[PDB]
Design an enzyme around this catalytic site. Sequence first.
Site, mmCIF file in Angstrom:
data_model
loop_
_atom_site.group_PDB
_atom_site.id
_atom_site.type_symbol
_atom_site.label_atom_id
_atom_site.label_comp_id
_atom_site.label_asym_id
_atom_site.label_seq_id
_atom_site.Cartn_x
_atom_site.Cartn_y
_atom_site.Cartn_z
ATOM 1 N N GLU A 41 22.647 2.577 10.605
ATOM 2 C CA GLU A 41 23.046 1.230 11.007
ATOM 3 C C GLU A 41 22.272 0.772 12.239
ATOM 4 O OE1 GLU A 41 27.062 2.148 10.096
ATOM 5 O OE2 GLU A 41 27.656 0.035 10.010
ATOM 6 N N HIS A 98 8.107 3.889 9.259
ATOM 7 C CA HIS A 98 7.917 3.096 10.462
ATOM 8 C C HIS A 98 6.598 3.476 11.124
ATOM 9 C CE1 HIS A 98 9.119 0.525 13.784
ATOM 10 N NE2 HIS A 98 8.887 1.503 14.641
ATOM 11 N N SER A 106 0.827 -1.203 0.000
ATOM 12 C CA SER A 106 0.000 0.000 0.000
ATOM 13 C C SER A 106 0.863 1.255 0.000
ATOM 14 C CB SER A 106 -0.956 -0.003 1.195
ATOM 15 O OG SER A 106 -0.256 0.048 2.426
HETATM 16 N N1 LIG Z 1 20.278 -1.487 9.406
HETATM 17 C C1 LIG Z 1 18.866 -1.400 9.083
HETATM 18 N N2 LIG Z 1 18.350 -2.258 8.215
HETATM 19 C C2 LIG Z 1 17.036 -2.210 7.887
HETATM 20 C C3 LIG Z 1 16.184 -2.957 7.018
HETATM 21 C C4 LIG Z 1 14.919 -2.389 7.147
HETATM 22 N N3 LIG Z 1 14.978 -1.382 8.005
HETATM 23 C C5 LIG Z 1 13.869 -0.534 8.411
HETATM 24 C C6 LIG Z 1 13.381 -0.934 9.802
HETATM 25 C C7 LIG Z 1 12.274 -1.980 9.726
HETATM 26 C C8 LIG Z 1 11.812 -2.439 11.108
HETATM 27 C C9 LIG Z 1 12.154 -3.916 11.262
HETATM 28 C C10 LIG Z 1 12.080 -4.718 10.138
HETATM 29 C C11 LIG Z 1 12.389 -6.062 10.230
HETATM 30 C C12 LIG Z 1 12.774 -6.594 11.448
HETATM 31 C C13 LIG Z 1 13.116 -8.084 11.513
HETATM 32 O O1 LIG Z 1 12.978 -8.699 12.515
HETATM 33 N N4 LIG Z 1 13.621 -8.725 10.310
HETATM 34 C C14 LIG Z 1 13.971 -10.132 10.311
HETATM 35 C C15 LIG Z 1 13.013 -10.881 9.390
HETATM 36 C C16 LIG Z 1 11.575 -10.406 9.591
HETATM 37 C C17 LIG Z 1 10.551 -11.359 8.985
HETATM 38 O O2 LIG Z 1 10.780 -12.598 8.970
HETATM 39 O O3 LIG Z 1 9.478 -10.907 8.508
HETATM 40 C C18 LIG Z 1 15.402 -10.260 9.807
HETATM 41 O O4 LIG Z 1 15.729 -9.740 8.709
HETATM 42 O O5 LIG Z 1 16.257 -10.878 10.492
HETATM 43 C C19 LIG Z 1 12.856 -5.789 12.575
HETATM 44 F F1 LIG Z 1 13.240 -6.320 13.773
HETATM 45 C C20 LIG Z 1 12.547 -4.440 12.484
HETATM 46 C C21 LIG Z 1 16.244 -1.256 8.471
HETATM 47 C C22 LIG Z 1 16.833 -0.352 9.397
HETATM 48 O O6 LIG Z 1 16.050 0.633 10.009
HETATM 49 N N5 LIG Z 1 18.127 -0.460 9.669
HETATM 50 N N1 LIG Z 2 9.387 -0.439 9.830
HETATM 51 C C1 LIG Z 2 8.894 -1.804 9.741
HETATM 52 C C2 LIG Z 2 7.387 -1.847 9.620
HETATM 53 O O1 LIG Z 2 6.698 -2.073 10.603
HETATM 54 N N2 LIG Z 2 6.889 -1.607 8.403
HETATM 55 C C3 LIG Z 2 5.473 -1.466 8.193
HETATM 56 O O2 LIG Z 2 4.965 -2.467 7.294
HETATM 57 C C4 LIG Z 2 3.791 -1.975 6.623
HETATM 58 C C5 LIG Z 2 3.822 -2.324 5.149
HETATM 59 O O3 LIG Z 2 2.626 -1.861 4.523
HETATM 60 P P1 LIG Z 2 2.471 -1.937 2.921
HETATM 61 O O4 LIG Z 2 3.236 -3.173 2.505
HETATM 62 O O5 LIG Z 2 0.978 -2.008 2.697
HETATM 63 O O6 LIG Z 2 3.117 -0.653 2.464
HETATM 64 C C6 LIG Z 2 3.746 -0.462 6.877
HETATM 65 O O7 LIG Z 2 2.616 -0.172 7.693
HETATM 66 C C7 LIG Z 2 5.070 -0.123 7.565
HETATM 67 O O8 LIG Z 2 4.985 0.922 8.517
#
Ligand SMILES: Nc1nc2ccn(CCCCc3ccc(C(=O)N[C@@H](CCC(=O)O)C(=O)O)c(F)c3)c2c(=O)[nH]1
Ligand SMILES: NCC(=O)N[C@@H]1O[C@H](COP(=O)([O-])[O-])[C@@H](O)[C@H]1O
Length: 200
Positions: free
Chosen positions: A141, A108, A12
Amino acid sequence: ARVAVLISGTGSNLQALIDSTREPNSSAQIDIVISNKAAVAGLDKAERAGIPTRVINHKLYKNRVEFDSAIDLVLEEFSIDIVCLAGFMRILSGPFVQKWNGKMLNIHPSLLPSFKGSNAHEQALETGVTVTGCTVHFVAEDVDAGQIILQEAVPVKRGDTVATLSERVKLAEHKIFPAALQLVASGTVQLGENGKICWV
Ligand SMILES: Nc1nc2ccn(CCCCc3ccc(C(=O)N[C@@H](CCC(=O)O)C(=O)O)c(F)c3)c2c(=O)[nH]1
Ligand SMILES: NCC(=O)N[C@@H]1O[C@H](COP(=O)([O-])[O-])[C@@H](O)[C@H]1O
């Protein structure tokens, strides 16, 4: 500016970014959509929009760096300037984040610094906040250093669940994510040399 959108699911936010970047005054163009999951609805929206798609399966790589490095090759192939993480649920390695520092946005579903991590809505409901929201920020990071670009508050309503709250927050996401992309793509907002947001 040339933009790649990385997705993992419904898309979305991708659709909101597509709608906005097609406006005549858009300073951003979406040239490639990359998903780590095949058969996700986000891929259909891209194809309906005539945008090239590439599925890169994280489960087919010896490690994260080799997986991120695969994505980076597609980004260079399409001469991408800005990377939008729109529901991308795969943490990116340090060197990748380092390379794209100041050029990669993420949406986020919370008012950072509150409720970092993967289940922001659950955290907000457990905590009992009456105001939550969403945040577009530069990807750093450690998620505790990502510079904030835009935010929008969204009320938490009595009896809210993840389903109803996430639905309300996504309406705000679909507003600030296209606006934030437009700010970065136009050079109005950048990661200043001091590392903080710089408004030009
Ligand atoms: N360095 C950095 N990298 C990235 C990549 C996306 N982002 C944006 C932040 C997204 C928030 C987030 C997203 C995923 C997890 C997570 O748990 N991922 C697992 C697999 C998940 C699954 O199986 O669906 C894994 O990849 O191990 C989480 F803990 C928090 C960031 C960031 O901000 N920084
Ligand atoms: N930062 C990690 C996280 O929680 N991401 C969240 O996943 C959804 C994807 O929606 P979409 O696939 O319909 O755009 C969004 O609501 C976004 O904030």
